[PDB]
Design a protein around this ligand. Structure first.
Ligand SMILES: CN1c2c(O)nc(N)nc2NC[C@@H]1CNc1ccc(C(=O)N[C@@H](CCC(=O)O)C(=O)O)cc1
Ligand code: NA
Ligand code: NA
Lengths: 304, 304
C-alpha cells in the first residue's frame, strides 16, 4: 500500500491509478508502429482500415473478457500520417489514445491539425513530456487544451530511480517534467520512468513506487522495446519469448504499477491473459492491504 | 529485505533461502504424478526409463542455462511404485528430491524400504510434515535419519498469513509443525504455506513474507495444482496457458519467495525462462540496496 493519497483519473471512462487492487491494470497497445505491415505508406498514413478495425475489435473483446481497460498507442512518422491515424481512431473506437511519435515536430504538427476539439481534450493523451521538451511544444499543448499527458523520465543522464524522480520533480536550475506539463495546462500525469533494458525494469518499477509513494500519480512503463531487443530470448521462439515478455510486463504490476504499454496490439491476446492473472492475485490481497475494489469490472471476478 | 537473518540451506549442492536477490529461485518439477503418461502402472511402478532420463537431462540443461537449481518432486500412489521411482532418481540425477504422495502411508512405506542410507539423508526431502502428521510418520522420518523436510504450514483454521506463526510455533495445547519436525530429527525446514486456488496465491506469498521476516526459513509454494485445474485458461492452448502459468509461478518470487513447485516437468522449458527473467530483474535491484549475490551462477549474469 502506497503512502500518498492516490490520484485516480477518469479518462473518457477509463479509470487509471489508485492503491494496488483498487482498479485493474490499463493496457496500452501500439498501432501504426515502425514496420507495422497493415501500413502500406508510413509517410502518407495509408493502411488497411479493415485490419486496423479488427485489431480495435480484438482489443474491445479482450477488455470485455478480463476487465482490463485499454488506451490505444497511436504512432506516426509524419504529421500527415499521424493526423489521419488519429481521425481513424476517433471514429472507429470510443477508447482514449496516446498521440505518439519519436519526433516532437510530428506530435506538435498533428496537434495543430486537430485544433481546439472537446473530443480531443477528453480522449487524446500527449506522449510525451520528456527531457527534450520545448516552449513551442508546451504552447501547442496549451492551445489544444489537453489535460492528460504521459510524463516520460526516460534519460541516459538519469539511470538510478532517484535521478528519474529529480527529472520529474525538478532539481537545481531545472523545473522538472511535472512543472513543465503544468505550464502547458496538463492537470493529469501518467508517469512513465522509461525502460532502459530488461534487467533495469526493476529500477523502472522502483521509480514508479517512489512516484506513487510521494506524489500519488498513476505509474506505468513500456518494456516492449527492451524485450524485442533481447536477442538471446527472442531467438528461442514461442512460447519462450511470450513467457519472458509476460514476466517483464507483469513485474511492475506485482509492485503496484497502474498501466503497461505492452507493444504491438497483435500481442494483446497473450498480454491480457498474463496481466489479468496478476491483477486477480493482487485484488484478492485487498483485505490484507485495507483496499476496496473501485469497480466490479475486475479480472478477479471475470477470468475464473 | 527481511529483519531475521535468513537460513540458506545447502541440500547436496542446492542453495535455497536468503535475502531476495542473494540466491536464484529453486525450481521443483513433478515426475510420476497421477496421469503422467510415462507411467503405465501406478501400483507396480512401471514407467518409461528413457522418457524419465530425458526429463531429468532436460532439467539439468535448463538449470545450466539459467542458473536456477532444481529439486525433483517424486510422486507415487503405492509403496512399491514410489520405492522404484526414488531408486531410479538416485541413479539417474545428482539433484535432491521430494519424497511425495497424497497418502502418508505411501511415504512411510517407501521410507522403510529406502532405509537410513547416507545418500537418502543428504538428497531425500520429506514432502511433507502437515497439520495431520502422525507419530508413526515422525518415527519413520527419524528411523530414515532425514535432516530436511517441507513444512506444509497450511490449515483452514489459519487462512490468514500471520496464523502461520501459530502452525509453525504451535498455539494452546497444539504442538507446532517445527517442534514436530525437530522431534523427528529434522534440522532444515522448507516452509510451504499451501495454495488453495490461483487468486489466493497472494495470501500464500504474504505467509512466505511473514515466515522470512520473523523466522528466516526458506519460503515457497506449489501453485501448480491451482493452475492445471484452471480449465478456462488451459483449454486456450499455446501461448495463453504458458503466460497465465508464468504470471502465477513468478508472482511469489516478485514478493521474495525462495522456491516454486511448478508441476509437471514437461513445462520446465517455459517455466525456467519465465522464472529466470523475474530473478534477473530482482537481482538487478541489488545494485541499489547493496545485497550481494551468493553465487555467480545467477540468471542476471546468464540469460542476457
Ligand atoms: C498439491 N501439491 C503440492 C503442494 O501444494 N505442496 C507441496 N509441498 N507438495 C505438493 N505436491 C503435489 C502437488 C504439486 N505437484 C503437482 C501439482 C499438479 C499436478 C497436476 O496438475 N497434474 C495434472 C496432469 C498433468 C498431465 O496431464 O500430464 C493433473 O491434472 O493432475 C501434478 C503435480
Ligand atoms: Na488487439
Ligand atoms: Na532466493
Amino acid at each position: 500500500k502506497f503512502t500518498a493519497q492516490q490520484h485516480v483519473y477518469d479518462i473518457n471512462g477509463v479509470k487509471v491509478g489508485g492503491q494496488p487492487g483498487e482498479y485493474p491494470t490499463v493496457l496500452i497497445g501500439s498501432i501504426f508502429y515502425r514496420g507495422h505491415k497493415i501500413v502500406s505508406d508510413g509517410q502518407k498514413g495509408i493502411f488497411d482500415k479493415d485490419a486496423a478495425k479488427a485489431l480495435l475489435d480484438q482489443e474491445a473483446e479482450l477488455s470485455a473478457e478480463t476487465g482490463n481497460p485499454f488506451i490505444i498507442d497511436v504512432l506516426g512518422e509524419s504529421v500527415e500520417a499521424l493526423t489521419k491515424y488519429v481521425e481513424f481512431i476517433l471514429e472507429n473506437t470510443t477508447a482514449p489514445f496516446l498521440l505518439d511519435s519519436i519526433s516532437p515536430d510530428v506530435r506538435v504538427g498533428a496537434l495543430k491539425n486537430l485544433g481546439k476539439d472537446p473530443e480531443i481534450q477528453k480522449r487524446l493523451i500527449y506522449n510525451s513530456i520528456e527531457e527534450h521538451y520545448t516552449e513551442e511544444e508546451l504552447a501547442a499543448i496549451k492551445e489544444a487544451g489537453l489535460k492528460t499527458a504521459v510524463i516520460l523520465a526516460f534519460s541516459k543522464k538519469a539511470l538510478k530511480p532517484n535521478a528519474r524522480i529529480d527529472l520529474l520533480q525538478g532539481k537545481d536550475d531545472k523545473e522538472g517534467l511535472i512543472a513543465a506539463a503544468k505550464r502547458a495546462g496538463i492537470e493529469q500525469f501518467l508517469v512513465d520512468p522509461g525502460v532502459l533494458d530488461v534487467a533495469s525494469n526493476s529500477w523502472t518499477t522502483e521509480a514508479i513506487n517512489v512516484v506513487k509513494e510521494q506524489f500519488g500519480y498513476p505509474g506505468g512503463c513500456a518494456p516492449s522495446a527492451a524485450v524485442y531487443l533481447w536477442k538471446k530470448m527472442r531467438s528461442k521462439g514461442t512460447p519462450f519469448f511470450e513467457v519472458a515478455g509476460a514476466a517483464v510486463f507483469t513485474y511492475p504490476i506485482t509492485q503496484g504499477a497502474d498501466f503497461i504499454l505492452y507493444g504491438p496490439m497483435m500481442n494483446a491476446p497473450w498480454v491480457y491473459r498474463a496481466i489479468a492473472t496478476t491483477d486477480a492475485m493482487i485484488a484478492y490481497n485487498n483485505k490484507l492491504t485495507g483496499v476496496k475494489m473501485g469497480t466490479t469490472e475486475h479480472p478477479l471476478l471475470k477470468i475464473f
